[PDB]
């Protein structure tokens, strides 16, 4: 028997039969380095779609930059309204740059221990805060 | 004398039509033992015999009882239980695998992806082998620490979400991290070509660094900077 | 025995540190010939890191080769619609610039 | 009978057993060219050579120059002149040729600043014959080697097409007409039931340490080949012979190595004196396995202990530097940190003489090859072998020299390969089984799943393993034995008044455990009925009556100005114990040991002497 053959063989037996699949997500212990894996996920989704939406309508919808600016005082002027949207684009986006450093400075190798990882996982958290608050207000 | 709690994860193949549950088991901890597989082990001699697990070295050293207890997973013969009464144990098998019978997975495929490697010294000439000695400075050997010491419990792979979505083609952190031992190991004379192997989308670039792997790990080796450092010779290796 | 994979893993890195870059660049230097650069670096990187999604969840060959195709038709619209924006609009770099200001 | 589904398999040659010593005799069966089947109940990781902590002896002469009949010598002197010296000639002169072989696989074996394979001192070893000091040739990975080794023999093991039937619990031995034809296997995996044929077969199951109640053993290690062999008819030799290892915690019974003892480990009493100095002059505390464990044991019964109730001795590894513990002993710094709760580099871990090792075993020669008795003489059982823990080439005869265990799992497993390549061809006529052969094994089986009398499998293991432990322990007397004896009798007429619960045949374990308890069962009346009819004190087996050691001569004054003794008056000699399997009685004799050596001229024959280090 080869290695190739004993791994076709084993999904034979398991597909075929009665047998359950293990509870995986629903009981495993929550912590931050997956948390925080998820939602370098979830931005880097969500800033494609916001990126994909600004260049698919440049082409697909009519009207300049410009006269879509004149369009947006629509609904007042936004008191403090107009600083959350600003904060909702910025947030997602500060996540993912300093995640993102974090990442490349693993594929280094440097910092990939459990205390190091729960350190710059804080250090990451923290920035995001006082880099959106920062340029939200400009 | 104090009571703890055991909820335990069931399922009876040989039962006509049998789901899937949950079994909680009432034990004395003055005389039970200090280690979890210790409790496992009452409930099977005297409270329920149906119960089936792994179990070998009870001394962690050989992998055998590795599970899921209260979210991570470790060898229940080296977790010690929560003395706070207060709280029920929750004991699962290891997250997202067949199960065969109660807390016993099916691990064919882990052992099957283990031979794929060839965890074994390749020289290009051994018409002098079972002679000599092969020489490795105690530099060189050194650079074994934190490799050699794996047991193949599979705790750290099947703590791997990437290994859940894609556990058909990616080898995960236990498989992986022995390419590596393997590569420097220098009495191997095979190195390049064991990297030429992961050149695929699945078999080493599903990592994502998540550190699941690191962290659960009941023998505190480091399987995630392993794969990562495959991931720079892999990157700085020419021909 | 050709390295594909590593030199896409390596690509990879190489546009991530280029855009983590560029961003102070447009800030410091916001010019016409930047919009263009940031545009092919956010395009590239974009999707780079879906093929990354596409090849993690989408199960099957079957469904496998329109989603790869399905995800390169919307990268080739979304940099065409950056150039056109740059070319003929405003430019990226000052769009920005008067939506902050409002 | 009409309701389990039988399986025929054929094959060149079947290894039971997937351990050290299994390995080595299954891949270095398909390196020669035979379709090979190994049967394991475990997975070959999780077999009990990982817990191998100490080293493995060869004379590669590192640390300092060295030959390897000085190594013989030792073993020799360890075995109480019981060791069959035939085959201490064959291991330790095969001693430097495997642990190369070893090396060349994969083993990561530490190194010195010349880069060679890192020796270490060990008990009961000594240079120049007894003469030169202290030795060191205990080859060692760190304090993982006996885990590395069953890794790169895995690992290695890979490279051929050898089957392997991982978690199938072997029940008994295909036997007719006094040949071996395989073995007849339950697989736990979906509970069919399997007939393994083969030419030849090897019996590598390890020991039977789980019949007593305190043990460094796993808990799979209940020999079963053993008694699979016993179910035969066949003989078992040495099975009184019980090493009880010094140093092993109070707690769980878990081991800490005697490399502890090595690199420069003390035992200390409540006094605060070093009181290996007092019995032991010249080695100390380290010594031989039966010299140590003897003082210890002795030590408690004075009422000098060291515990909360007063029944433990303290090894102390305080003096030592922390960085030498760091480097050379990391597996004994992280198991005593968890069972203990206690640190090593400063404070001492409580030890405590616990069983470990089993020299008795199958009959076997040099060779590899199961040996019957027949009319007072030796008949080799054709296409049947052994090698291991589970096999008695008797390499340790009374007392099992440290560090020779892993070394006689690797020469003597490479031997039964050899031996099988010699005698017979691959490709060779397989013989034929009869097609009703092996159903009683199976009617056996049917009678413990359906089991349902008045005592459990749980509390009749219980009432085993603590009448061994209080009656067959380091000291034993007549009186105790054969109260003892009588006492295990009577659990042997209960086994059928047995209780089960689970009627599953994926994963019976509550039927797996039965059928463990039935092996230990016969493996524990062979211990105690032959250690109660010795009347002698020779290595591990020491009576309090009588602790004169007694020989064909007697060797403590001047020879051949003497008269000989005869064969059934002295008690040089191996114990052969049959026990009839229906009835649970026990009959044994006795057979004479080897003295002579494979080549005088090359190795000279060691008699008989005062034995004390
Ligand atoms: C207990 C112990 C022993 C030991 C040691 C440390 C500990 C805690 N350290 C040693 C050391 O440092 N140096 C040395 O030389 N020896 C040391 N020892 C003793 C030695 O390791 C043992 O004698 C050795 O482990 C025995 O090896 P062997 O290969 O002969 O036996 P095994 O490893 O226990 O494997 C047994 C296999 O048999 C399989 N099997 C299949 N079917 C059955 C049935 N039905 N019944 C029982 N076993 C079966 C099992 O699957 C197992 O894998
Ligand atoms: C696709 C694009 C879609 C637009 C939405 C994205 C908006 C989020 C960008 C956050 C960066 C804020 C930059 C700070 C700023 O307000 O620039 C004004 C300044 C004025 O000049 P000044 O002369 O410096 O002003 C004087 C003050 N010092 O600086 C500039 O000139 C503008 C430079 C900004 C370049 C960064 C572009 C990043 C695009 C990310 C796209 C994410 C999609 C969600
Ligand atoms: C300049 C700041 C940025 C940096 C430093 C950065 C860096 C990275 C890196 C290195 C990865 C790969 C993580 C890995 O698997 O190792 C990644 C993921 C990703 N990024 Fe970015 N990125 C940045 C901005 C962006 C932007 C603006 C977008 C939106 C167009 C984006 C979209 C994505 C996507 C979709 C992924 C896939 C998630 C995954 O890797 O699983 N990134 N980022
Ligand atoms: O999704 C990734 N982790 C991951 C880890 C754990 C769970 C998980 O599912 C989710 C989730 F997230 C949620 F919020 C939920 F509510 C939910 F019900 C899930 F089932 C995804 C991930 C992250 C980064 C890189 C690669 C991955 C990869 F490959 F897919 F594993
Ligand atoms: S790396 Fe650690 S968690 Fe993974 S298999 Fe090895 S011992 Fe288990
Ligand atoms: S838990 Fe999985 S993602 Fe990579 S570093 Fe880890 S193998
Ligand atoms: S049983 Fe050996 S690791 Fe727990």
Same mark, same amino acid.
């Given at each position: 028997?080869?290695?190739?053959?004993?791994?076709?063989?084993?999904?034979?037996?398991?597909?075929?039969?009665?047998?359950?699949?293990?509870?995986?997500?629903?009981?495993?212990?929550?912590?931050?380095?997956?948390?925080?894996?998820?939602?370098?996920?979830?931005?880097?989704?969500?800033?494609?779609?916001?990126?994909?939406?600004?260049?698919?309508?440049?082409?697909?919808?009519?009207?300049?930059?410009?006269?879509?600016?004149?369009?947006?005082?629509?609904?007042?002027?936004?008191?403090?309204?107009?600083?959350?949207?600003?904060?909702?684009?910025?947030?997602?986006?500060?996540?993912?740059?300093?995640?993102?450093?974090?990442?490349?400075?693993?594929?280094?190798?440097?910092?990939?221990?459990?205390?190091?990882?729960?350190?710059?996982?804080?250090?990451?958290?923290?920035?995001?805060?006082?880099?959106?608050?920062?340029?939200?207000?400009? | 004398?104090?009571?703890?709690?055991?909820?335990?994860?069931?399922? *009876?193949?040989?039962?006509? =039509?049998?789901?899937?549950?949950? /079994?909680?088991? %009432?034990?004395?901890?003055?005389?039970? &033992?200090?280690?979890?597989?210790?409790?496992?082990?009452?409930?099977?001699?005297?409270?329920?015999?149906?119960?089936?697990?792994?179990?070998?070295?009870?001394?962690?050293?050989?992998?055998?009882?590795?599970?899921?207890?209260?979210?991570?997973?470790?060898?229940?013969?080296?977790?010690?239980?929560?003395?706070?009464?207060?709280?029920?144990?929750?004991?699962?098998?290891?997250?997202?695998?067949?199960?065969?019978?109660?807390?016993?997975?099916?691990?064919?495929?882990?052992?099957?992806?283990?031979?794929?490697?060839?965890?074994?010294?390749?020289?290009? *000439?051994?018409?002098?082998? =079972?002679?000599?000695?092969?020489? /490795?400075?105690? %530099?060189?050997?050194?650079?074994?620490? &934190?490799?050699?010491?794996?047991?193949?419990?599979?705790?750290?792979?099947?703590?791997?979400?990437?290994?859940?979505?894609?556990?058909?083609?990616?080898?995960?952190?236990?498989?992986?991290?022995?390419?590596?031992?393997?590569?420097?190991?220098?009495?191997?004379?095979?190195?390049?070509?064991?990297?030429?192997?992961?050149?695929?989308?699945?078999?080493?670039?599903?990592?994502?660094?998540?550190?699941?792997?690191?962290?659960?790990?009941?023998?505190?080796?480091?399987?995630?900077?392993?794969?990562?450092?495959?991931?720079?010779?892999?990157?700085?290796?020419?021909? | 025995?050709?390295?594909?994979?590593?030199?896409?893993?390596?690509?990879?890195?190489?546009?991530?540190?280029?855009?983590?870059?560029?961003?102070?660049?447009?800030?410091?230097?916001?010019?016409?010939?930047?919009?263009?650069?940031?545009?092919?670096?956010?395009?590239?990187?974009?999707?780079?890191?879906?093929?990354?999604?596409?090849?993690?969840?989408?199960?099957?060959?079957?469904?496998?080769?329109?989603?790869?195709?399905?995800?390169?038709?919307?990268?080739?619209?979304?940099?065409?619609?950056?150039?056109?924006?740059?070319?003929?609009?405003?430019?990226?770099?000052?769009?920005?610039?008067?939506?902050?200001?409002? | 009978?009409?309701?389990?589904?039988?399986?025929?398999?054929?094959?060149?040659?079947?290894?039971?057993?997937?351990?050290?010593?299994?390995?080595?005799?299954?891949?270095?069966?398909?390196?020669?060219?035979?379709?090979?089947?190994?049967?394991?109940?475990?997975?070959?990781?999780?077999?009990?050579?990982?817990?191998?902590?100490?080293?493995?002896?060869?004379?590669?002469?590192?640390?300092?120059?060295?030959?390897?009949?000085?190594?013989?010598?030792?073993?020799?002197?360890?075995?109480?002149?019981?060791?069959?010296?035939?085959?201490?000639?064959?291991?330790?002169?095969?001693?430097?040729?495997?642990?190369?072989?070893?090396?060349?696989?994969?083993?990561?074996?530490?190194?010195?600043?010349?880069?060679?394979?890192?020796?270490?001192?060990?008990?009961?070893?000594?240079?120049?014959?007894?003469?030169?000091?202290?030795?060191?040739?205990?080859?060692?990975?760190?304090?993982?080697?006996?885990?590395?080794?069953?890794?790169?023999?895995?690992?290695?093991?890979?490279?051929?097409?050898?089957?392997?039937?991982?978690?199938?619990?072997?029940?008994?031995?295909?036997?007719?007409?006094?040949?071996?034809?395989?073995?007849?296997?339950?697989?736990?995996?979906?509970?069919?039931?399997?007939?393994?044929?083969?030419?030849?077969?090897?019996?590598?199951?390890?020991?039977?340490?789980?019949?007593?109640?305190?043990?460094?053993?796993?808990?799979?290690?209940?020999?079963?080949?053993?008694?699979?062999?016993?179910?035969?008819?066949?003989?078992?030799?040495?099975?009184?012979?019980?090493?009880?290892?010094?140093?092993?915690?109070?707690?769980?019974?878990?081991?800490?190595?005697?490399?502890?003892?090595?690199?420069?480990?003390?035992?200390?009493?409540?006094?605060?004196?070093?009181?290996?100095?007092?019995?032991?002059?010249?080695?100390?505390?380290?010594?031989?396995?039966?010299?140590?464990?003897?003082?210890?044991?002795?030590?408690?019964?004075?009422?000098?202990?060291?515990?909360?109730?007063?029944?433990?001795?303290?090894?102390?590894?305080?003096?030592?530097?922390?960085?030498?513990?760091?480097?050379?002993?990391?597996?004994?710094?992280?198991?005593?940190?968890?069972?203990?709760?206690?640190?090593?580099?400063?404070?001492?871990?409580?030890?405590?003489?616990?069983?470990?090792?089993?020299?008795?075993?199958?009959?076997?020669?040099?060779?590899?090859?199961?040996?019957?008795?027949?009319?007072?003489?030796?008949?080799?059982?054709?296409?049947?072998?052994?090698?291991?823990?589970?096999?008695?080439?008797?390499?340790?005869?009374?007392?099992?020299?440290?560090?020779?265990?892993?070394?006689?799992?690797?020469?003597?497993?490479?031997?039964?390969?050899?031996?099988?390549?010699?005698?017979?061809?691959?490709?060779?006529?397989?013989?034929?089984?009869?097609?009703?052969?092996?159903?009683?094994?199976?009617?056996?089986?049917?009678?413990?799943?359906?089991?349902?009398?008045?005592?459990?499998?749980?509390?009749?293991?219980?009432?085993?393993?603590?009448?061994?432990?209080?009656?067959?322990?380091?000291?034993?007397?007549?009186?105790?034995?054969?109260?003892?004896?009588?006492?295990?009798?009577?659990?042997?007429?209960?086994?059928?008044?047995?209780?089960?619960?689970?009627?599953?045949?994926?994963?019976?374990?509550?039927?797996?455990?039965?059928?463990?308890?039935?092996?230990?069962?016969?493996?524990?009346?062979?211990?105690?009925?032959?250690?109660?009819?010795?009347?002698?004190?020779?290595?591990?087996?020491?009576?309090?009556?009588?602790?004169?050691?007694?020989?064909?001569?007697?060797?403590?004054?001047?020879?051949?100005?003497?008269?000989?003794?005869?064969?059934?008056?002295?008690?040089?000699?191996?114990?052969?114990?049959?026990?009839?399997?229906?009835?649970?009685?026990?009959?044994?004799?006795?057979?004479?040991?080897?003295?002579?050596?494979?080549?005088?001229?090359?190795?000279?024959?060691?008699?008989?002497?005062?034995?004390?280090?």
């Amino acid at each position: 028997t080869t290695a190739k053959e004993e791994m076709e063989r084993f999904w034979n037996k398991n597909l075929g039969s009665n047998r359950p699949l293990s509870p995986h997500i629903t009981i495993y212990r929550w912590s931050l380095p997956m948390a925080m894996s998820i939602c370098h996920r979830g931005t880097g989704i969500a800033l494609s779609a916001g990126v994909s939406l600004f260049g698919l309508s440049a082409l697909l919808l009519p009207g300049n930059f410009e006269s879509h600016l004149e369009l947006v005082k629509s609904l007042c002027l936004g008191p403090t309204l107009i600083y959350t949207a600003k904060f909702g684009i910025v947030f997602p986006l500060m996540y993912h740059t300093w995640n993102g450093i974090r990442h490349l400075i693993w594929d280094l190798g440097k910092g990939l221990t459990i205390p190091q990882l729960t350190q710059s996982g804080v250090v990451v958290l923290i920035l995001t805060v006082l880099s959106s608050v920062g340029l939200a207000a400009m | 004398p104090r009571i703890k709690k055991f909820a335990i994860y069931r399922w *009876d193949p040989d039962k006509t =039509g049998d789901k899937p549950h949950m /079994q909680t088991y %009432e034990i004395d901890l003055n005389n039970c &033992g200090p280690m979890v597989l210790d409790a496992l082990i009452k409930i099977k001699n005297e409270i329920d015999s149906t119960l089936t697990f792994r179990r070998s070295c009870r001394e962690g050293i050989c992998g055998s009882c590795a599970m899921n207890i209260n979210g991570g997973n470790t060898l229940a013969c080296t977790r010690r239980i929560d003395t706070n009464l207060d709280k029920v144990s929750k004991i699962y098998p290891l997250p997202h695998m067949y199960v065969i019978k109660d807390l016993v997975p099916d691990l064919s495929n882990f052992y099957a992806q283990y031979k794929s490697i060839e965890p074994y010294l390749k020289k290009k *000439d051994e018409s002098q082998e =079972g002679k000599q000695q092969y020489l /490795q400075s105690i %530099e060189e050997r050194e650079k074994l620490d &934190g490799l050699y010491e794996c047991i193949l419990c599979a705790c750290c792979s099947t703590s791997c979400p990437s290994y859940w979505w894609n556990g058909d083609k990616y080898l995960g952190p236990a498989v992986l991290m022995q390419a590596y031992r393997w590569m420097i190991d220098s009495r191997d004379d095979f190195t390049e070509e064991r990297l030429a192997k992961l050149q695929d989308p699945f078999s080493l670039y599903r990592c994502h660094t998540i550190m699941n792997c690191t962290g659960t790990c009941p023998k505190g080796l480091n399987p995630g900077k392993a794969i990562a450092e495959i991931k720079k010779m892999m990157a700085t290796y020419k021909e | 025995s050709s390295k594909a994979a590593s030199l896409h893993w390596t690509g990879e890195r190489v546009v991530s540190v280029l855009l983590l870059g560029l961003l102070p660049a447009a800030y410091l230097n916001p010019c016409s010939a930047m919009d263009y650069s940031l545009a092919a670096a956010l395009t590239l990187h974009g999707h780079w890191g879906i093929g990354q999604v596409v090849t993690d969840y989408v199960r099957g060959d079957a469904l496998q080769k329109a989603a790869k195709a399905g995800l390169l038709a919307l990268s080739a619209f979304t940099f065409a619609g950056l150039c056109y924006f740059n070319y003929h609009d405003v430019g990226i770099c000052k769009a920005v610039a008067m939506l902050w200001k409002l | 009978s009409t309701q389990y589904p039988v399986v025929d398999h054929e094959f060149d040659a079947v290894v039971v057993g997937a351990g050290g010593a299994g390995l080595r005799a299954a891949f270095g069966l398909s390196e020669a060219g035979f379709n090979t089947a190994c049967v394991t109940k475990l997975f070959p990781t999780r077999s009990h050579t990982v817990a191998a902590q100490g080293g493995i002896n060869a004379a590669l002469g590192n640390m300092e120059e060295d030959n390897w009949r000085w190594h013989f010598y030792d073993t020799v002197k360890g075995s109480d002149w019981l060791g069959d010296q035939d085959a201490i000639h064959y291991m330790t002169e095969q001693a430097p040729a495997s642990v190369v072989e070893l090396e060349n696989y994969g083993m990561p074996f530490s190194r010195t600043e010349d880069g060679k394979i890192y020796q270490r001192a060990f008990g009961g070893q000594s240079l120049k014959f007894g003469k030169g000091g202290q030795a060191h040739r205990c080859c060692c990975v760190a304090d993982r080697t006996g885990h590395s080794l069953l890794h790169t023999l895995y690992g290695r093991s890979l490279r051929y097409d050898t089957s392997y039937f991982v978690e199938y619990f072997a029940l008994d031995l295909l036997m007719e007409n006094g040949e071996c034809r395989g073995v007849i296997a339950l697989c736990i995996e979906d509970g069919s039931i399997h007939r393994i044929r083969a030419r030849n077969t090897v019996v590598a199951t390890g020991g039977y340490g789980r019949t007593y109640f305190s043990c460094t053993s796993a808990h799979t290690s209940t020999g079963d080949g053993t008694a699979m062999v016993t179910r035969a008819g066949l003989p078992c030799q040495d099975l009184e012979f019980v090493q009880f290892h010094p140093t092993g915690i109070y707690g769980a019974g878990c081991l800490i190595t005697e490399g502890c003892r090595g690199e420069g480990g003390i035992l200390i009493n409540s006094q605060g004196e070093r009181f290996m100095e007092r019995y032991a002059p010249v080695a100390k505390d380290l010594a031989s396995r039966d010299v140590v464990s003897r003082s210890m044991t002795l030590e408690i019964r004075e009422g000098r202990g060291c515990g909360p109730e007063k029944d433990h001795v303290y090894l102390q590894l305080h003096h030592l530097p922390p960085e030498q513990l760091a480097v050379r002993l990391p597996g004994i710094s992280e198991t005593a940190m968890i069972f203990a709760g206690v640190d090593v580099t400063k404070e001492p871990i409580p030890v405590l003489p616990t069983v470990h090792y089993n020299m008795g075993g199958i009959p076997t020669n040099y060779k590899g090859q199961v040996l019957r008795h027949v009319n007072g003489q030796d008949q080799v059982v054709p296409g049947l072998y052994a090698c291991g823990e589970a096999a008695c080439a008797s390499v340790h005869g009374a007392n099992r020299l440290g560090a020779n265990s892993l070394l006689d799992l690797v020469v003597f497993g490479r031997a039964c390969a050899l031996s099988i390549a010699e005698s017979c061809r691959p490709g060779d006529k397989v013989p034929s089984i009869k097609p009703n052969a092996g159903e009683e094994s199976v009617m056996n089986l049917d009678k413990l799943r359906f089991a349902n009398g008045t005592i459990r499998t749980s509390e009749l293991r219980l009432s085993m393993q603590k009448s061994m432990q209080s009656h067959a322990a380091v000291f034993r007397v007549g009186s105790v034995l054969q109260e003892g004896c009588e006492k295990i009798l009577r659990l042997y007429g209960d086994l059928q008044h047995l209780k089960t619960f689970d009627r599953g045949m994926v994963w019976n374990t509550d039927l797996v455990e039965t059928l463990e308890l039935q092996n230990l069962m016969l493996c524990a009346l062979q211990t105690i009925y032959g250690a109660e009819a010795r009347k002698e004190s020779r290595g591990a087996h020491a009576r309090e009556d009588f602790k004169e050691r007694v020989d064909e001569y007697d060797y403590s004054k001047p020879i051949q100005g003497q008269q000989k003794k005869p064969f059934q008056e002295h008690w040089r000699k191996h114990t052969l114990s049959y026990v009839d399997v229906k009835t649970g009685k026990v009959s044994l004799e006795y057979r004479p040991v080897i003295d002579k050596t494979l080549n005088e001229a090359d190795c000279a024959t060691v008699p008989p002497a005062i034995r004390s280090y």
